[PDB]
Amino acid sequence: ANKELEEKNRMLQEDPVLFQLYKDLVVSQVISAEEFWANRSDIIESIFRTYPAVKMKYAENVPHNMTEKEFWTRFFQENSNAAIIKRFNHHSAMVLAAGLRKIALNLKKSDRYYHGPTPITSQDIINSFQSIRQEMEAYTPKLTQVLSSSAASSTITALSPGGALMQGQMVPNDIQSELKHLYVAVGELLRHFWSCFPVNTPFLEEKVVKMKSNLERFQVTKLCPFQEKIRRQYLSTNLVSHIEEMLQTAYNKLHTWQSRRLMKK
């Protein structure tokens, strides 16, 4: 059946983001669309489920020279006393049937955590210890020793923006939307490209997807510079170099791992 066609129509306009990027892969005629998707009331309903007799009646009494309002009228319509008990037990039984479809841890080296991932004679201790011991026998020099006009002033100058220890542009905005669209464009297609890359997949069926994806990387990126060229040749300002890293670094991973494959063979 044409299940895919119906799904596309539902998402044709309901959600822009999903369809917006899918077309872009075909706007420039990059690759076939087959690989795109291949890789990636209540009251009447209750009576419909609850009472089998109504279900049978509805099929046999399907609207024919009648009205739904008239059908609604038919719903509500000592021996009579027993009917309520039988109906409720039957009704309760039907509802019930309706909802029933047929290690102590241990370690060898805990010191490693104490000196964790963060990376990096004897007489000197004695000599230093004694010298400091006799240092503070004179104390409370606060009057002048703590600060001086020259020393204090130098600190203020350093704290100024020009001074040391105090080091200290949204011009493009319309272009921002295109980059975000491009960013989603790269992310949407990189995801599939990186979907199988981390896993080695030593199998032809899984590896074939890698080759198709690996070749597809060039195809999607073949058209990328063309869009880049137009944007770049505007004011030569606010260069977009990050977007290149993902593609170039994707190439390097592709080329390196592809080269590694030959060595393994």
Partner 1 sequence: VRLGMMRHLYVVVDGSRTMEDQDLKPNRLTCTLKLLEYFVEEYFDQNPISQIGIIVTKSKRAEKLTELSGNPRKHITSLKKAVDMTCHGEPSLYNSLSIAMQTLKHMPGHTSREVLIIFSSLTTCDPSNIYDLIKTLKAAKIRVSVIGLSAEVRVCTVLARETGGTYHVILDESHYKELLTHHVSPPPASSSSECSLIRMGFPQHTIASLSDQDAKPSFSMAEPGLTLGGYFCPQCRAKYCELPVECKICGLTLVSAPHLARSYHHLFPLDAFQEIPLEEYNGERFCYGCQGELKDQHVYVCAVCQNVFCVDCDVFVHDSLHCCPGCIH
Partner 2 sequence: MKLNVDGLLVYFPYDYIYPEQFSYMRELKRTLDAKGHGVLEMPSGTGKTVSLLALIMAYQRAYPLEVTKLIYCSRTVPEIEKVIEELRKLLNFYEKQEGEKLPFLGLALSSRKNLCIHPEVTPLRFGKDVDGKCHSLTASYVRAQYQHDTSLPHCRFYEEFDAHGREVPLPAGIYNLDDLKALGRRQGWCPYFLARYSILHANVVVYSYHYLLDPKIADLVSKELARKAVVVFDEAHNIDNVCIDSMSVNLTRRTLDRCQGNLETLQKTVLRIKETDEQRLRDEYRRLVEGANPVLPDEVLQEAVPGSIRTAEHFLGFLRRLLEYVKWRLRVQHVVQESPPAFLSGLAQRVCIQRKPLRFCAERLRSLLHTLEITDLADFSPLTLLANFATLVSTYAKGFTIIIEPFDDRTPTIANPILHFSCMDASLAIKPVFERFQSVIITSGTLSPLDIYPKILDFHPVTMATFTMTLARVCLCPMIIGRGNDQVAISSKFETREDIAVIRNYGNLLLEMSAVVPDGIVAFFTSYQYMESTVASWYEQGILENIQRNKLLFIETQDGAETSVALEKYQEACENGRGAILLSVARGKVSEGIDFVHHYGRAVIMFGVPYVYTQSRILKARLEYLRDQFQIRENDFLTFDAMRHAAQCVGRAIRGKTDYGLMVFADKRFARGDKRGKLPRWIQEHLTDANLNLTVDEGVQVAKYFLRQMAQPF
Residues contributing to the site for partner 2 (CB under 8 A): 81-82, 84-86, 88-89, 92-93, 95-96, 99
Give the nearest distance from C-beta 132 to partner 1 in angstroms. Answer: 21
Whichever of 118 and 144 has its CB closer to partner 1, that residue is 118
Whichever of 34 and 42 has its CB closer to partner 1, that residue is 42
Of these partners, partner 1, partner 2, none, which one is at the site of residue 89 (CB under 5 to 8 Å by kind)? partner 2
Among 249, 251, 257, 258, indicate the residue that binds partner 1 (CB under 8 A). Answer: 249
Q: Which residues contact 194 (CB under 8 A, 6 or more apart)?
A: 250
How far is it, in rounded angstroms, from Cα 44 to Cα 52?
13
Whichever of 89 and 160 has its CB closer to partner 2, that residue is 89
Among 118, 134, 149, 259, indicate the residue that binds partner 1 (CB under 8 A). Answer: 118
Q: Cβ of 192: how many Cβ atoms within 10 Å?
A: 18
Nearest CA-CA partner of 213 in 232, 195, 230, 193? 193
Cβ atoms of residues 179 and 240 within 8 Å: yes
Give the nearest distance from C-beta 77 to partner 2 in angstroms. Answer: 16
Q: What are phi and psi of 116, to 5 degrees?
A: -75, -155
Give the nearest distance from C-beta 109 to partner 1 in angstroms. Answer: 13
Give the nearest distance from C-beta 71 to partner 2 in angstroms. Answer: 22
DSSP state at residue 192: H
Cβ atoms of residues 219 and 38 within 8 Å: no
Burial 220-259 (b: 16+ CB within 10 A, else e): bbeebeeeeeeeeeeeeeeeeeeeeeebeebeebbeeeee
Site residue total, partner 1 (CB under 8 A): 32
Give the nearest distance from C-beta 123 to partner 1 in angstroms. Answer: 25
Among 82, 85, 105, 156, indicate the residue that binds partner 1 (CB under 8 A). Answer: 105
Whichever of 99 and 141 has its CB closer to partner 1, that residue is 99
Give the nearest distance from C-beta 120 to partner 1 in angstroms. Answer: 15
Give the nearest distance from C-beta 84 to partner 2 in angstroms. Answer: 5
Cβ atoms of residues 168 and 161 within 8 Å: yes
Footprint (CB under 8 A) of partner 1, residues 29-68 = none
C-alpha atoms less than 13 angstroms from C-alpha of 167 in its C-beta half-sphere: 0
How far is it, in rounded angstroms, from Cα 21 to Cα 88?
56
Q: Which residues contact 172 (CB under 8 A, 6 or more apart)?
A: 237, 238
Whichever of 82 and 120 has its CB closer to partner 1, that residue is 120
Of these partners, partner 1, partner 2, none, which one is at the site of residue 240 (CB under 5 to 8 Å by kind)? partner 1
Binding residues for partner 1, rule: CB under 8 A, are 99-101, 103-105, 110, 113, 116-118, 170, 176, 179-180, 183, 187, 190-191, 194-195, 198, 238-243, 245-246, 249, 253
